[PDB]
Write an enzyme that holds these catalytic residues in place. Sequence first.
Site, mmCIF file in Angstrom:
data_model
loop_
_atom_site.group_PDB
_atom_site.id
_atom_site.type_symbol
_atom_site.label_atom_id
_atom_site.label_comp_id
_atom_site.label_asym_id
_atom_site.label_seq_id
_atom_site.Cartn_x
_atom_site.Cartn_y
_atom_site.Cartn_z
ATOM 1 N N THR G 1 -19.519 -31.505 1.648
ATOM 2 C CA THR G 1 -19.644 -30.023 1.550
ATOM 3 C C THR G 1 -20.589 -29.484 2.618
ATOM 4 O O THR G 1 -20.293 -28.484 3.271
ATOM 5 C CB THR G 1 -20.156 -29.590 0.166
ATOM 6 N N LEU G 2 -21.731 -30.148 2.787
ATOM 7 C CA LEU G 2 -22.728 -29.747 3.769
ATOM 8 C C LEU G 2 -22.653 -30.555 5.058
ATOM 9 O O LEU G 2 -23.446 -30.311 5.972
ATOM 10 C CB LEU G 2 -24.133 -29.870 3.168
#
Lengths: 232, 233, 240, 245, 227, 246, 230, 231
Positions: G1-2
């Site tokens: 996600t990051l």
Amino acid sequence: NLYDTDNIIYSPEGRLYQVEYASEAIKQGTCAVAIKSKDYVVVSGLKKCISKLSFPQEKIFKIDDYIGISMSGITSDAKVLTKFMQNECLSHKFLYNENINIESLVRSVADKYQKNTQKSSKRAFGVGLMIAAYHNEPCIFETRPNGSYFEYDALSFGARSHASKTYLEKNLHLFEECSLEELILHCLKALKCSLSSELTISNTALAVVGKNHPWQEISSLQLEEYLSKVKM
Amino acid sequence: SYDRAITVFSPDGHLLQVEHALEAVKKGGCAVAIKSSNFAVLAVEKKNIPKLQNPKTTEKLIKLDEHNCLAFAGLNADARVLVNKTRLECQRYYLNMDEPAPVDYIAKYVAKVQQKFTHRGGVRPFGIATLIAGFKNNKEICIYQTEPSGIYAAWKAQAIGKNAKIVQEFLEKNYQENMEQKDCIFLALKAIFEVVELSSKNVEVALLTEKDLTFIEEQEINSMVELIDQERT
Amino acid sequence: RRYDSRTTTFSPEGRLYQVEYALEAINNASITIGLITKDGVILGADKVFISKLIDKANNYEKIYKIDKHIFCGVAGLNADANILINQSRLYAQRYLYNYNEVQPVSQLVVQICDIKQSYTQYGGLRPYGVSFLIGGYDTKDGYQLYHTDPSGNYSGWFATAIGTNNLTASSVLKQEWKNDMTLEEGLLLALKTLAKSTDTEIPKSEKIELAYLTNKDGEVYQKYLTEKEIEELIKLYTQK
Amino acid sequence: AGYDLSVSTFSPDGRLYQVEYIYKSINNNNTALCLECKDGIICCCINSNMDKNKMIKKNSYNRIYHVNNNIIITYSGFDGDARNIIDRARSEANTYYYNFHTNIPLHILVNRISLYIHAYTLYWHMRPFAASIIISSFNEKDKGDIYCIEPNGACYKYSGIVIGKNKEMFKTEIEKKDYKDINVRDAIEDIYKFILTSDDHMNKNNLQNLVNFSWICKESSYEFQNIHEEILTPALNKAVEYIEK
Amino acid sequence: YSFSLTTFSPTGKLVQIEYALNRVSSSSPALGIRAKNGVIIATEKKSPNELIEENSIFKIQQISEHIGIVYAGMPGDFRVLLKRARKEAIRYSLQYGSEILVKELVKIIASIVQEFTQTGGVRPFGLSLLICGVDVYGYHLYQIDPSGCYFNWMATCVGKDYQNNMSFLEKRYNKDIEIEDAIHTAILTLKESYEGVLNEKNIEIGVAYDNKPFKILTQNEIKDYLI
Amino acid sequence: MYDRHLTIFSPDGNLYQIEYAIKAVKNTNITSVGVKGENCAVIISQKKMATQYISQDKLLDYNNITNIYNITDEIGCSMVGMPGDCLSMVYKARSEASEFLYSNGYNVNAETLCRNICDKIQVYTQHAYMRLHACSGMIIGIDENNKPELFKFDPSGFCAGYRACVIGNKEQESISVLERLLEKRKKETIDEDIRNTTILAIEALQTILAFDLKASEIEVAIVSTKNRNFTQISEKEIDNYLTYIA
Amino acid sequence: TLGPVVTGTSVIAIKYKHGIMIAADRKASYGSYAKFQNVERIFKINNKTVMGFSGELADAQYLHELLTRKNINNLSEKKRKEDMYTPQHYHSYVSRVFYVRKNRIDPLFNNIIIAGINSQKYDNNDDNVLLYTNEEYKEIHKDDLYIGFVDMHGTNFCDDYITTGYARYFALTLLRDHYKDNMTEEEARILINECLRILYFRDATSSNFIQIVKVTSKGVEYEEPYILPC
Amino acid sequence: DRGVNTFSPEGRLFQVEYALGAIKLGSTAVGICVNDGVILASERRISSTLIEKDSVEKLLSIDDHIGCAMSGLMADARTLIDYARVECNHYKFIYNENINIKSCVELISELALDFSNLIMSRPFGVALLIGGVDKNGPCLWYTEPSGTNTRFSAASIGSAQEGAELLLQENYKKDMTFEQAEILALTVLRQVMEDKLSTSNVEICAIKKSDQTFYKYNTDDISRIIDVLPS
């Protein structure tokens, strides 16, 4: 007696009276009739005219290319359901780039019926629909105020439907394997039988949807020609 | 109940709650309004227990805005609630338009809110009949009258409350255009006393002009009532 | 829906039938009095007797204070009275918080009557069956006295009695009250009215409670008479 | 005496009449049966009420659905309520698979559906579901499992069950012999004979356009599969011939 | 769907509150006494069969380290009110860092009962609380009611035949009564009202001993006191 | 009018809905008996269908029927009433136990669980839009002090501890039998006490029901310091104990 | 996600007579560590559909879950073999998902390939589907095969051959230079082997342990993993 | 005794039936359409003389090209008109062109039926006659509480609407000129109305094809039309 005050109370015999009254309202409406053959599905109806200074009310409706419906009952509920179905089809084509599966759409509308009838403080739609389409095959569907849908090969709605149903059952075995012209003619015969006081290019609605044939209502010229053909 | 329809149509096609509100309005005190040229006169009855009640507490005739003013007949608590709502609306209009609220707009808003309280569930109709006097956006004097059902109408001379029909009939045969201030006050007092006991303590009349709403002094009211009593007899 | 009580609904004559029953209940409660004098405002009341074992010390069941300059008396249901008193205190302190000044009495009575009207109009909740007599003092208007009711109606008064037998007490007040009066004379009149309304020739020191608010030395303060003070007061009344 | 106008009110005798009325309504709807055999389980549904309608396509009205392609779920009652419950079952299976990356065990799904149905019978505003549901499965190791949930919200396990019209006669027929030793393929004959005998509305011509059939057995690799015509027709013809004699 | 199930009747009278009071009048009696240097709350539990254990059902609780409570009515309502009273005392202690004053807690509980009487879709509580305690302002003994109105008592009784019990208690009572004498008077009143034979496991008592924690007397102590 | 259609007081202070729910619980005519000794507690019930519209059929798996569940490995329960109500109640008990463990770090005690369930039942009784759950129950467990504890709760939300209790019909006539058996007991190894408690429970159920109690028709479970888990005894040992009683 | 942590290398999908062929190495690198050397990076949605992968592993697994459960839902309400969703359907679905995530600024660090057959006139496999447990190949017109690409920013398109990751430079060049039409399975495998060998020599994140899958008239076939001849 | 949305044994909602009965009273209005444009006329039932006669208006404008005429409950009619004009201006903002009359009546009916949950609390109990011109032509529509709207060539509403529509049936004929339509409408309105027609006794509005703009006849135009009125 006293079990018809709410739509959430089962009678001693186990029946919901409000849904039955909605079905009664559907029956009280004007007429309609749908037929299908190997190809092409023909829908016909009697546009109600209230006075000589009133144009007959629109009866049939187009929900999407190759999909059309006919109404019987409350007009407002018909409008609501038509908007729902049109938005569903448009969204499906928007986010999938393909035509919507007709069976899924009928499931969705029946589910809306069910949701409305279940919870209290809400009434059941008093309108019946006549879905006709060609999703790689001619299909006719019918819905009811209670969450329930069936798929037919010859259908009629409300008014004096007895005559149309008798004619349809009397000539059902010929509908399959007959050209579009004869299909239209037979649909007009059924509508005229239900009429019980004549068919004119103004008070009758007719539509066809079939293979390589997007849903299109029959224009005045061809409609009058077919009316003359049936008259003779 | 909470969020459920209470005002519903009757078999004959009548809103029974609205008619009960009208009946309650017919129960309250009387009020009269006149207009002429560039000024109006508002009169209302008064009823207090001698030696015990404080007259100042009564607020039958009120000023909504710098220019507009209002009178009413019916329930008092609902009157106060609706008056507060109207003042808030006046100030909201002055915020969003940088112009004082015209009489027509505020009358429209009062009608709108009274209709709303008749068409939404969980709330019963506003049992009060009001009449507003003010100046239009073009500096023209006008008075409107609003009813519990929400129906509003502009009038040249009007009366509401108990025996409103009788005072209305009296006005219908005496009103004249562009009258003098003294004549207007005299007519308003005569009308209010037509269906009200004769005494200077049963009326609190006021005069609306562009300057401000001026309450008529008690001495002048006493003189006027004595004069009308003399004329009547 | 089948069990709905039809609370916030106009009557065939426009009365709602609920404020009526609330006021009827009000008429059955103990009597409360209110007077305005040249030295203060008095809210003498009558205590309802339940038994002989109730704590005499303190235990004021009719008169309360909402601020240093505002104090009232109840003539209805005690629970509704208590919650409305709490609301009044909240409102007064909120006004002080907002404007950094003490709230005039008219504002407080307007607010409390507004909440009563809200309970009478919106929802299906029953109205409050309590009627107060809010009295106090402020610079703008000086000594004042009001009288509320379940409908949210309020009106100013110079002398009043509410509750059971309010008619006789009001008659006495109208017969004897004067525009100006000393605080002592006001207390004597309140005691006389309480005795007459109770149908007792001589009031019992254990059957009544008195209080008064005065702006002595520019600092408004309330005093609630205790058993010995009311005893001396009744001795004076009997002497006269 | 006012104790049957709401599902949320107990009767003086301690009984919810509003649920008995649902039971009565269910008992009058089309009949559905399901039983287990050696190879697998067979579920049959009989839509005898629709014999009046002559315009429905042949075998278009189906009352047998599946979840995870290996659990058969069927009903006998209102179509809308049954569809709602089927969608809830699908949603429950979806959440289970998302959470645990594995198919939901049947005895958990039945419990969840029973709770969902029961949750609608203790408020006044909601309308209790008028449907009786059967959920069944089969695997070579644990053999067939059949469960029946009902409007009251009670789930019980069976070795063979019938619900709806003429349920008593059908049950009497089923317990006539032991079907735990009969094969799935040759049980169709007995089913057909039972539906012909018990029901007094269906005849030879009605058997190929009103009765829905399906099984989960070893032939289908223990996965849901509607019975095709080539298998159904021989058994139907044999059964009608046997009855005629 | 939220409407007031309790409504004013002709002449008012809040019939539902009257029925709650009737319920209270039929439950087991419970009384309390304020003494010179302590307060007592006593009650009678019906003679339990051999299967019950008095250690599992308790009609005397404690809200704080100095405040005790007894009830007469519906056990479930009593339990929920007890939990909410404990929560109120806890939050008062969190805010002001001290033991909650008796009057304040009585006010909160009375307000809660009143709200339950007012709100829609609910019915009034069917009990009559009784709170005793000690604080910097001496001793206190209050009584809540289903109507939500509290009274400040010096000695009181609630429940069945509460009028006779109150009269008897008034007959023999003093403002300067010793704590032991108050216990004895409570026992005598309960015995008179019982109409039977009393003994350990048939009565329950709680006492606030001066500046000492509120104590619920054990079986042996009451047995010794009975002799 | 409607004085008893809802959980409303009605005259003379009677919530008739409570009594009707209790009577519905009684109508199920399923009997359950719980008895505690020392370091052991035994819960027994019948393995039969309840009483309702549906009747038991031949093609019904009788092993599946059971009136005893377990809230946690250590805390056991037995419900009697409407089937859906029983399932909902056991699920609520499981949820409360799990939340208690999550929010307190140690396994819940049966006493607290009974109190919390009684609180939920009280909430149901208080409001009008909620129907009453007609399902009574017993809970058994062992506390931190290594001692048994057994509690009972009714549709009225009245949770109370017990040393010998019965749910179902003829409870009033069964308290006498339980008292007599407990008195006879009052007149042992850590495991001999387990056997004595089990035989006492079986004998009590036999006397109350007044017939054989086929080993296939009854179900028994026990919690003791020897095991501490709510494990239900199998059919063979139940039959052996029953033969011993004879 | 990051941000990617555990990543795949690349995939190559090409359509040929009898269907489509998709290949990918079986390795997931943890930066410059090569922790896992046996990972299935080519998933299956249904018969006539498979999903590629080159990017973060968690997002690929989440998308696989979404797609497989969408297929389950499709089957649950299926009545005719024409009701099965086509590769175009799934490609548009994943494109919409990626676009929504982009608009939310929480994308999936992946570059997806959705490849299959969007025609039902060639086989009767979908008339009786079997999720658990499992003649001559039929020539397929190239118009009936579908391969679609999906980028982080939602960019998508269709073509006759698609590659992701570093394969977009080496394998893409080789295919554009040499790819033919209607090539037999042997020729397609030879071309894929050449491309993957080139990647293995000039790609640190690649490896020679290869998984090759074929979508044909017989369905989806997972061929046994083999080591590149080198 | 029953909910707002309780079906009847015959399938008709009770509240809708009562609203339809209620709309039977009020000021009479008449509308006509011709190839040249649409005309609307109202009774203008003036109360006591003390009213200004300007505050009481029966012919509002939904938009520049759309006219209306209400009957029944006045406050509900004003609410519906406000919503209609708001939606028409929203349409104009979203699309450069102006809203078609059909779409406007569709939205008004949607709002009217909003009361049934499928917010408002009961049927509006109003009957509206909308008339206007668009690129498609000039036309007028009729709306009632039940929600069903119908296009009309010559219609009447309000108390005595039966007589007005009977006269329109007896007289109205296709291919009529705008002056003919005006004189016919005024003849019918005068016939059905109680008092004598005058400048201040009735009010008219018309929308033309060439103008396509709503225009309300003032004292001069009404005086001219009454002057040439056959009698």
